[PDB]
Design a binder for these strands. Structure first.
Ligand SMILES: *Nc1ccc2c(c1)Cc1ccccc1-2
Length: 580
DNA sequence: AGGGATGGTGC
DNA sequence: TGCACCATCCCT
C-alpha cells in the first residue's frame, strides 16, 4: 500500500521539471508568518519530499519556485504563496489550484483538504488532513516518516486529479472562470492579506477605556433597576429578571427559554426602563468585546497591522469571507460603532484610504437578468430605487412618497436582494404575513419581468438541478424538489437569489483583476487592501487620489457590460472612517 | 477543552 | 434569520 518516494537530503535538477504537483505545507490555520513544515514534489521523474530548511535555502529551488514558466499544480496555493511571502520568497507559475477547482464544481461539498476533493472522483489513496494532524489541542505535526508520506500522497492526488477536474470544468463551461478569474484573483488576495491594514492601537485602546467606563455605569444602573445583580450576558438569567421578576410580556419564545434579541427588547422598552439600558449595554459590549478587544488581539505588535485571511473557497454564492480578523463586518450603520473605523489608517505617511462601492449592484444585476422594462428604465435614469419602488407599489407620485413609504419599499428591495423568507419580510415591516405577501403582489405588478424571472429560474433549477451566475459559477439545489414546504421554499429562494448575489460577486472579482492590471500599467503605488462584497478599499499616496477618483470607478463600472449601467461611488480620507 | 444555543455586526 | 464571522454563556 505504501507509496514510493525519495526522502531527499538535497535538491536535484530532476525535482525542477517544468510541470509538477507542488505541496508547501503550512499546518497552522492562520498562515501569516507561519512555519512551512515540509515540501513535496511530484513530476514525470517521480515523487520527492524535501525538508523546508534545505529546499528554501537552495538557490535553484527558490529560482524554480519563482519561475513563471515552471508550472505547478497545487491545493490552496494562496496559503503557500503568503507563507512564502513572509519568508521573502516569490511563488509563480501556479497553473492549477485543486481547492478552487473543487469549489467551482460544487461549493456545497465543503472541500477543505485534498482528500475531500479527491473523494469527488472516487480517489481515496490520501488521508484527510485532520486525520494526520489531529484537531484542536491535540493538533500536532507528526514524525517525518508520517509527515512525508502524507505530503507525497497529497501531491500525488493533485498530480492525478488535475486532468479530470479540468475536464469537468470544461464540460460545465467553467474552465475560464477558474483560469481567468479565481486563480488570478487568488494571487491578488495574497498580496492584500500580506500587505495588511495599519491599525492605530492607541486610538483603539483609548476607545476601549471609554467603553469600559460607560459599560460600568450602565451595568450598575441595570442592577439598580432590577433590584439585584446578575449576569446580563446570560439569556438565562436575563430572562428570569425580565419575564419573571419584572413580569414583562413574553412576545417571543426560544428553544430553551425566553427570547431576548434586540428586536424583542425594543418592543418591551415602553414597559420598563431596564430594557433600554440592557439594549445600550449590549451595544457597548459588542463594540468592546468583538471589535476593540477582538482587534487588539490580532494586531501584530511589530508593525501594528492586521492581516486578515480571505477564504476564497467557502461561500455558496461566490463571495469571499474574512477571518482573524473579519474585516468585512466592521460597524458603520450606527455612529458610535462607526467610530471604530478611525482606527484603520494608511500604512505610510502622507498616504490616504480610498474606498469605492457599487451603487445597488444587486438590483442592477436583477434588472439585467430579468430584463424587466420598468426596473431597467429606473436604473437608466439613475433613479432613487427605493423611492421609485414606493411610487409603483403604492401608486403615488414622487412628491407623495412619505418617509415610511420609502422605508417599507426599501425593506421589500432588501428582501429581494438577500432572498429573505416571507416571514423575515413581514417582521422587517412589522406586519402580518398576509399583508406582506400583498406587498410582494403589488411589486410583481409593477415589475412583471422580475416575476417571470423568479418563476423561470425556479423552474430551471428544478430542470437542470442547479442555477448559474453571469460568469458560470454554479450552485446545486437538490431541495428544490423536496415535498417539505419549508425546505423547498428555501431552495426556491436560493434559486432566485444566487444568480443575483453570485453575479455581483463575479463582477467585483473581475473588477479587482482589471484594476490591478490598470494600477500596474500606470505604475501607481496605490494598492488594494480589502474587498467588502460590493466595495473595494485601497490606500495610496495623497498625490494619487485625483487619478484614483477617475480610474477606480471606471474600472469597476466597466468590468462587465449589462443592459443597465453600473454605477460606483467613491470617497477618501486620512482614515477608513473618513473615506465616508 | 469542545461546541451547541443565542445574539449581533457586515453586505 | 437570506451569504458570512464571532462574541459569551454553559452543558458535557
Ligand atoms: N434571510 C432572512 C431570514 C429570516 C429573517 C431575516 C432575514 C431578518 C429577520 C428578522 C426577524 C425574524 C426572521 C428574519
Amino acid at each position: 500500500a505504501a507509496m514510493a518516494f525519495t526522502l531527499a537530503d538535497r535538491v536535484t535538477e530532476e525535482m525542477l521539471a517544468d510541470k509538477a504537483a507542488l505541496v508547501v505545507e503550512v499546518v497552522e490555520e492562520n498562515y501569516h508568518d507561519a512555519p512551512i513544515v515540509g515540501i513535496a514534489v511530484v513530476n514525470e521523474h517521480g515523487r520527492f519530499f524535501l525538508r523546508p530548511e534545505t529546499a528554501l535555502a537552495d538557490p535553484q529551488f527558490v529560482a524554480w519556485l519563482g519561475d513563471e514558466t515552471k508550472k505547478k499544480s497545487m491545493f490552496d496555493s494562496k496559503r503557500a504563496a503568503v507563507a512564502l511571502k513572509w519568508k521573502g520568497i516569490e511563488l509563480c507559475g501556479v497553473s492549477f489550484d485543486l481547492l478552487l477547482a473543487a469549489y467551482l464544481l460544487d461549493p456545497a461539498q465543503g472541500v477543505d483538504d485534498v482528500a475531500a476533493a479527491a473523494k469527488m472522483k472516487q480517489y481515496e489513496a490520501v488521508r484527510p488532513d485532520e486525520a494526520v494532524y489531529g484537531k484542536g489541542a491535540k493538533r500536532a505535526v507528526p514524525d517525518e516518516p508520517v509527515l512525508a508520506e502524507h505530503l507525497v500522497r497529497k501531491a500525488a492526488a493533485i498530480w492525478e486529479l488535475e486532468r479530470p477536474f479540468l475536464d469537468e470544468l470544461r464540460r460545465n463551461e467553467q474552465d475560464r472562470l477558474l483560469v481567468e478569474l479565481e486563480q488570478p484573483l487568488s494571487s491578488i488576495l495574497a498580496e492584500m492579506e500580506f500587505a495588511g491594514v495599519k491599525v492605530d492601537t492607541k486610538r483603539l485602546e483609548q476607545m476601549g477605556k471609554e467603553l469600559a467606563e460607560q459599560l460600568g455605569t450602565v451595568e450598575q444602573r441595570i442592577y439598580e433597576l432590577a433590584g439585584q445583580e446578575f449576569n446580563i450576558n446570560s439569556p438565562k438569567q436575563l430572562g428570569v429578571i425580565l419575564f419573571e421578576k419584572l413580569q414583562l410580556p413574553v412576545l417571543k419564545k426560544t428553544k430553551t427559554g425566553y427570547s431576548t434579541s434586540a428586536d424583542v427588547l425594543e418592543k418591551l422598552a415602553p414597559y420598563h426602563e431596564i430594557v433600554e439600558n440592557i439594549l445600550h449595554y449590549r451595544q457597548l459590549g459588542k463594540l468592546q468585546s468583538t471589535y476593540i478587544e477582538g482587534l487588539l488581539k490580532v494586531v501584530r505588535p511589530d508593525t501594528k497591522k492586521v492581516h486578515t485571511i480571505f477564504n476564497q473557497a467557502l461561500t455558496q454564492t461566490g463571495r469571499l469571507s474574512s477571518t482573524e480578523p473579519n474585516l468585512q463586518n466592521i460597524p458603520i450603520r450606527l455612529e458610535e460603532g462607526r467610530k471604530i473605523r478611525q482606527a484603520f489608517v494608511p500604512s505610510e505617511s502622507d498616504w490616504l484610504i480610498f474606498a469605492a462601492d457599487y451603487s445597488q449592484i444587486e438590483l442592477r444585476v436583477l434588472a439585467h437578468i430579468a430584463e424587466d422594462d420598468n426596473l431597467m428604465e429606473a436604473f437608466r435614469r439613475d433613479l432613487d430605487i427605493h423611492t421609485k419602488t414606493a411610487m409603483d407599489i403604492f401608486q403615488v407620485s414622487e412628491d407623495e412618497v412619505t418617509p415610511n413609504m420609502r422605508r417599507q419599499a426599501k425593506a421589500v428591495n432588501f428582501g429581494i436582494v438577500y432572498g429573505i423568507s416571507d416571514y423575515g419580510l413581514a417582521q422587517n415591516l412589522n406586519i402580518s404575513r398576509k399583508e406582506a405577501a400583498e406587498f410582494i403582489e403589488r411589486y410583481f405588478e409593477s415589475f412583471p419581468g422580475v416575476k417571470r424571472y423568479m418563476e423561470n429560474i425556479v423552474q430551471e433549477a428544478k430542470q437542470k438541478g442547479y442555477v448559474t451566475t453571469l460568469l458560470h459559477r454554479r450552485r446545486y439545489l437538490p431541495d428544490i424538489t423536496s415535498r417539505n414546504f419549508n425546505v423547498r421554499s428555501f431552495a426556491e429562494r436560493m434559486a432566485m437569489n444566487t444568480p443575483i448575489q453570485g453575479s455581483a460577486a463575479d463582477i467585483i472579482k473581475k473588477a479587482m483583476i482589471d484594476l490591478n492590471a490598470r494600477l500596474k500599467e500606470e505604475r501607481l503605488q496605490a494598492h488594494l487592501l480589502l474587498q467588502v462584497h460590493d466595495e473595494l478599499i485601497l490606500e495610496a499616496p495623497k498625490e494619487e487620489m485625483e487619478r484614483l477618483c477617475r480610474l477606480v470607478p471606471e474600472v469597476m463600472e466597466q468590468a462587465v457590460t449589462l443592459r443597465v449601467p453600473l454605477k460606483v461611488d467613491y470617497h477618501y480620507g486620512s482614515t477608513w472612517y473618513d473615506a465616508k
